[PDB]
Amino acid sequence: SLVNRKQLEKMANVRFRTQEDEYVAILDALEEYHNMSENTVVEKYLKLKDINSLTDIYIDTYKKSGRNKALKKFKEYLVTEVLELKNNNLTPVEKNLHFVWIGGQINDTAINYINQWKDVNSDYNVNVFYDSNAFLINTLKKTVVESAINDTLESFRENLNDPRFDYNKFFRKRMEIIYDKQKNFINYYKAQREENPELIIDDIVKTYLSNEYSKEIDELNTYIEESLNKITQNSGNDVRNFEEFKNGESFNLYEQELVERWNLAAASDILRISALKEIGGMYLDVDMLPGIQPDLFESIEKPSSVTVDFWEMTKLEAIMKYKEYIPEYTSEHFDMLDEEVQSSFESVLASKSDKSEIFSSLGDMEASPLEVKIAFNSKGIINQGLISVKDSYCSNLIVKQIENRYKILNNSLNPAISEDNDFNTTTNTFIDSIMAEANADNGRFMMELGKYLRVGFFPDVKTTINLSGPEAYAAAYQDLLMFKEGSMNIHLIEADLRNFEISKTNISQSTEQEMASLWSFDDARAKAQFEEYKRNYFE
Numbered sequence: 001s002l003v004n005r006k007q008l009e010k011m012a013n014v015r016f017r018t019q020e021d022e023y024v025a026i027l028d029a030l031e032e033y034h035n036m037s038e039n040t041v042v043e044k045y046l047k048l049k050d051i052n053s054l055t056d057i058y059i060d061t062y063k064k065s066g067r068n069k070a071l072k073k074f075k076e077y078l079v080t081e082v083l084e085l086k087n088n089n090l091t092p093v094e095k096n097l098h099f100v101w102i103g104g105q106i107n108d109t110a111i112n113y114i115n116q117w118k119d120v121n122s123d124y125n126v127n128v129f130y131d132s133n134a135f136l137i138n139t140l141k142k143t144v145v146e147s148a149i150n151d152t153l154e155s156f157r158e159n160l161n162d163p164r165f166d167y168n169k170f171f172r173k174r175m176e177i178i179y180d181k182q183k184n185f186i187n188y189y190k191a192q193r194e195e196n197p198e199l200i201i202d203d204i205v206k207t208y209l210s211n212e213y214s215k216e217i218d219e220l221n222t223y224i225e226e227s228l229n230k231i232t233q234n235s236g237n238d239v240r241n242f243e244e245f246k247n248g249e250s251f252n253l254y255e256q257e258l259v260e261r262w263n264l265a266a267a268s269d270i271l272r273i274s275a276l277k278e279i280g281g282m283y284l285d286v287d288m289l290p291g292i293q294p295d296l297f298e299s300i301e302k303p304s305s306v307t308v309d310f311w312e313m314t315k316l317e318a319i320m321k322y323k324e325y326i327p328e329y330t331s332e333h334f335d336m337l338d339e340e341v342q343s344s345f346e347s348v349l350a351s352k353s354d355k356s357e358i359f360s361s362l363g364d365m366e367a368s369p370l371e372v373k374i375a376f377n378s379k380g381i382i383n384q385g386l387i388s389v390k391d392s393y394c395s396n397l398i399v400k401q402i403e404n405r406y407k408i409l410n411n412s413l414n415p416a417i418s419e420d421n422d423f424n425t426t427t428n429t430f431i432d433s434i435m436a437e438a439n440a441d442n443g444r445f446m447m448e449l450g451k452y453l454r455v456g457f458f459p460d461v462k463t464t465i466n467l468s469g470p471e472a473y474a475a476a477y478q479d480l481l482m483f484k485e486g487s488m489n490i491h492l493i494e495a496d497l498r499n500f501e502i503s504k505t506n507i508s509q510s511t512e513q514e515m516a517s518l519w520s521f522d523d524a525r526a527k528a529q530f531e532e533y534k535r536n537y538f539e
């Protein structure tokens with residue numbers, strides 16, 4: 001409970017020192033805060049913000065004041081009061097589950113995962129967000145990348161047996177060709193948009209694919225039809241009917257990632273937070289599954305011979321092996337267990353008849369109007385799981401973080417692209433500008449932007465997490481606890497972030513599909529795909 005006016009007067013007391021206007025401003029504001037019983041949680045937080053600002057105004061005005069020590073202690077009590085305000089005043093979470101699949105046909109694997117959530121949360125409305133205008137982005141990315149592969153491997157033909165022509169050389173040379181093909185498409189998209197602003201993304205994409213890659217417009221229309229029909233009868237919710245998002249400051253960023261960068265994870269990052277802000281509820285990646293009942297595998301001890309991650313995977317594999325809720329779910333990890341351990345799993349699952357005995361239900365959830373709750377793995381916070389009440393204060397802060405982060409990026413990126421040079425020259429101008437504009441505040445953030453042009457086309461490029469992903473969420477939490485906006489220097493520790501954790505029992509994160517990233521890939525996969533592309537091209 002935050003100190004009252006009398007308690008602060010005692011802390012900041014200085015014998016025979018004038019009560020300065022700036023000091024009385026603080027005391028008045030603190031007194032007002034303690035008479036705000038019947039005000040909203042956000043109103044109370046905005047008051048605590050004022051009190052913090054007024055306290056800073058004082059310490060800045062009277063630099064050598066005997067009050068300053070006690071006022072620095074008071075600024076700490078304000079932060080504790082934000083957390084107490086967040087933990088003790090909770091409203092219901094709107095019973096919505098938000099999924100996103102944009103850029104192409106939703107796979108049966110995605111639907112089968114979504115259906116688990118539906119079966120165990122019959123009291124929840126389910127939105128599977130799609131873009132009715134952009135069903136051909138994934139077909140465009142795949143066509144350009146496969147053509148870039150063939151163009152690269154052909155350039156390798158003779159100097160092939162040479163170990164200098166490794167997987168690293170392949171991806172560097174292929175990137176140059178992907179960039180040229182990207183620029184060609186973006187230039188066509190813009191040309192078509194000035195000629196006829198009525199044309200939608202899929203109109204332009206399918207005409208581009210007909211012109212440049214001899215694709216049949218009739219086949220592409222059939223694919224759109226089948227994809228639109230499929231999502232239509234799986235709780236489909238059209239982005240092109242989401243007016244608040246379309247009229248907002250983030251839609252140009254969403255289309256930047258959808259249309260120019262072909263990064264559907266980045267576009268998903270921008271959409272999911274808008275959905276939570278405007279509607280409220282819980283966002284889940286299509287690779288997440290419901291929480292396993294805590295008591296289910298209580299009786300089965302984890303072998304020392306197996307990692308924590310291995311064990312969490314085998315739990316889901318066990319369920320799917322014996323209940324077959326998701327057809328052709330892997331048993332790769334379960335099948336490595338000793339027969340006695342496999343038997344323990346079978347015997348437990350044989351004693352369960354209903355899915356509600358395997359997976360838990362979200363039920364009535366409540367959160368602070370201040371907060372967006374976020375999922376955790378061993379590496380820290382991850383936006384694959386998000387809970388927020390409609391129009392939460394943090395949902396607003398996170399939108400503003402993403403918008404500010406893209407402003408800094410585009411400011412350095414757009415000049416470089418406008419010079420209309422090759423990938424290396426463009427990369428060089430971009431990084432020069434990044435390092436030029438970097439300061440003490442945004443230094444760390446700027447050092448992560450360098451690979452933006454390569455996202456999805458080159459191994460171990462994770463730029464998106466700094467722009468639209470987890471780092472935006474960490475920054476938004478810092479904004480809340482520091483009574484400010486626009487944090488770039490993240491100094492929060494685990495203990496701070498853990499106040500915003502989603503309970504581990506609400507999501508099963510260790511799924512088969514979670515282990516296969518859709519927008520990034522590591523060295524292991526790079527090496528593997530290179531060899532796969534080589535034997536395919538020369539047989």
Ligand SMILES: O=c1ccn([C@@H]2O[C@H](COP(=O)(O)OP(=O)(O)O)[C@@H](O)[C@H]2O)c(=O)[nH]1
Pocket residue numbers: 099100101102103104138264265266268284285286287384514516517518519
């Ligand atoms: O073609 C795509 C690829 C990805 N996504 C979205 O991107 C999210 C994150 O993808 P993934 O789980 O592969 O990211 P990771 O967990 O590997 O960071 C998914 O849940 C989808 O909402 C999409 O809509 N279309």
Ligand SMILES: OC[C@H]1CN[C@H](O)[C@@H](O)[C@@H]1O
Pocket residue numbers: 265266268269285382383384464465468469470
């Ligand atoms: O921010 C980009 C991705 C980071 N990993 C998350 O699981 C995924 O949901 C995001 O799209």
Ligand SMILES: [Mn+2]
Pocket residue numbers: 285287384513514517
């Ligand atoms: Mn994932």
